[PDB]
Design a binder for this molecule. Structure first.
Ligand SMILES: *[B-](O)(O)CNC(=O)c1ccccc1[N+](=O)[O-]
Ligand SMILES: [Mg+2]
Ligand SMILES: [Mg+2]
Length: 466
């Protein structure tokens, strides 16, 4: 039975789609410590988003399941009889789920607390982390897309998925031959518009490209949208998330009857402020709850912010250098051998990251007996579950198989890297597995990973739901 399983997995990895790839595959029974299957377990490979497994475990170790993040509005003293303040400060301490509604609810507080006029300027203070926005080796050409959003302690998160530091762009066709309408979302009046797009004839080809040219805060829209095409929406990052959060706050203020007479810009609460007047605050939900959208959908913003938040907890330094050491320390504290690990970011976006399949399984083991185990697995995608906040990146994989509803694992994909690691529970034991593929040339070997996951589900005594 053990050997049958082994031979099957051997054959599954015989797949042509893994030509010239190195593949780390490790499976361990977690009740007993038995090594059911091991191949290139010690080989160092890029992990893509499997890196979050590490990040998420450290954050729970360091910040705690119950941790929350705050944001405040501050003036040098409370407002007058006349309800006036000079400069106003929006100060973010790394909430990765600050919505536009929260900015609105905070603008109402500022009004309820008796401010009717900001006489001076409004500043957005994201100084709680440093201003290193992107990791060294992240690719400039990727900077327009949501997963590559700049990192700040003050960032507005869009939608129920909480994609930070982006804006929704929507392009509606008009009459054939007239320019397409471009709607910039939250970034209206913040990010610049270069609209070159046109409405093509009904039934013609869709060639619409939405971009943000490197080193600009301009949304450049080119190509042709068919007169009859459905409106197109795209998440595009903006330069300086905090300044957009600032921009949005001025609008929430004016909206809640508070007139801002100055400019909007970046700035930290001055040192020479004796006893700042906190005129509004927001508290995020707790880390346990935040893990869901972070891990289910592989949020890269959330990952880096958690790192910088760890840097803050361990060293009062909201920094990659500080946070990564923080992660490695936490993981050691956990019992994980971090020999094979090379940490270059929290998200896995970076090609400077290295894991081994043994280390991953190692982590999976330790996380299983940690007091925060449950909130940890709850965050992982569940195979073939169609409710996005349950299935996450595994929503449309392995449906109608023994793995459906059972396998909990994290995914990982970019050019020539794919990964799947997590658990198979069952009538046998709770299995921890890691599959990391590097160097394949075609599409990610998703079928190959599925096959393994499914056979492990069957080995743990599961059957495909019909
Ligand atoms: B992870 O999500 O497995 C690593 N992948 C990414 O960060 C990612 C996600 C979504 C789109 C692109 C992309 N890239 O790394 O290019
Ligand atoms: Mg605006
Ligand atoms: Mg089942």
């Amino acid at each position: 039975r053990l050997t049958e399983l082994r031979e099957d997995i051997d054959a599954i990895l015989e797949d042509p789609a893994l030509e010239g790839a190195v593949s780390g595959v490790v499976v361990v029974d977690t009740a007993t410590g038995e090594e059911l299957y091991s191949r290139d377990g010690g080989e160092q490979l890029l992990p893509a988003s499997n890196m979050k497994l590490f990040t998420a475990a450290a954050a729970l170790e360091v910040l705690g399941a119950d941790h929350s993040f705050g944001t405040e509005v501050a003036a040098e003293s409370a407002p007058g009889r006349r309800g006036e303040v000079q400069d106003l400060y929006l100060v973010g301490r790394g909430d990765p789920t600050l919505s536009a509604e929260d900015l609105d609810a905070m603008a109402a507080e500022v009004a309820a607390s008796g401010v009717r006029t900001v006489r001076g300027d409004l500043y957005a203070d994201d100084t709680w982390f440093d201003s290193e926005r992107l990791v060294d080796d992240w690719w400039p050409e990727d900077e327009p897309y949501a997963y590559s959003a700049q990192i700040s302690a003050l960032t507005v998160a869009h939608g129920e998925r909480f994609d930070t530091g982006v804006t929704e762009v929507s392009v509606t066709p008009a009459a054939e031959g007239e320019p397409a309408d471009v709607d910039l979302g939250a970034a209206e009046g913040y990010a610049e518009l270069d609209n070159r797009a046109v409405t093509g004839a009904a039934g013609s080809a869709n060639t619409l490209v939405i971009d943000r040219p490197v080193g600009t805060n301009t949304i450049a829209v080119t190509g042709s949208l068919p007169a009859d095409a459905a409106p197109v929406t795209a998440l595009r990052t903006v330069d300086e998330p905090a300044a957009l959060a600032g921009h949005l706050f001025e609008e929430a203020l004016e909206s809640n009857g508070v007139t801002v007479k100055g400019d909007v810009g970046l700035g930290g609460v001055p040192a020479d402020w004796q006893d700042a007047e906190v005129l509004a605050d927001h508290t995020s939900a707790e880390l346990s709850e935040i893990l869901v959208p972070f891990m289910k959908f592989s949020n890269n913003g959330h990952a880096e912010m958690l790192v910088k938040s760890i840097g803050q907890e361990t060293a009062g330094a909201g920094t990659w250098d500080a946070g990564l050491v923080g992660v490695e320390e936490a993981l050691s504290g956990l019992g994980v051998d971090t020999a094979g690990l090379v940490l270059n970011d929290g998200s896995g976006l970076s090609r400077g990251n290295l894991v081994t399949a043994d280390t991953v399984v190692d982590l999976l083991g330790q996380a299983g007996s940690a007091p925060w185990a449950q909130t940890w697995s709850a965050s992982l995608p569940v195979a073939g579950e169609s409710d996005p906040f349950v299935g996450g990146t595994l929503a449309n994989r392995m449906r109608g198989t023994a793995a459906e509803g059972v396998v909990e694992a994290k995914t990982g994909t970019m050019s020539g890297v794919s990964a799947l690691s997590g658990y198979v529970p069952g009538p046998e034991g709770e299995l921890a597995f890691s599959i990391v593929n590097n160097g394949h040339s075609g599409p990610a070997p998703l079928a190959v990973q599925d096959a393994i996951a499914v056979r492990l589900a069957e080995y743990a005594g599961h059957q495909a739901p019909e």
